[PDB]
Amino acid sequence: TASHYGQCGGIGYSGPTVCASGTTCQVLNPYYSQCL
Numbered sequence: 001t002a003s004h005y006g007q008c009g010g011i012g013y014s015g016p017t018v019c020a021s022g023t024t025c026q027v028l029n030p031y032y033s034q035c036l
């Protein structure tokens with residue numbers, strides 16, 4: 001799962017896009033999306 005304050009789903013990020021319970025993937029920039 002994506003981590004809190006970690007990148008959740010940006011362009012190029014092939015990692016876990018689904019956040020952990022209690023956190024939400026929020027796109028801050030097109031390439032940087034942070035799980036808050």
Ligand SMILES: *[C@H]1O[C@H](CO)[C@@H](O)[C@H](O)[C@@H]1O
Binds near residue numbers: 002003004006016
């Ligand atoms: C927070 O941790 C997760 C794995 O638990 C990463 O995928 C994420 O990019 C960030 O390092």
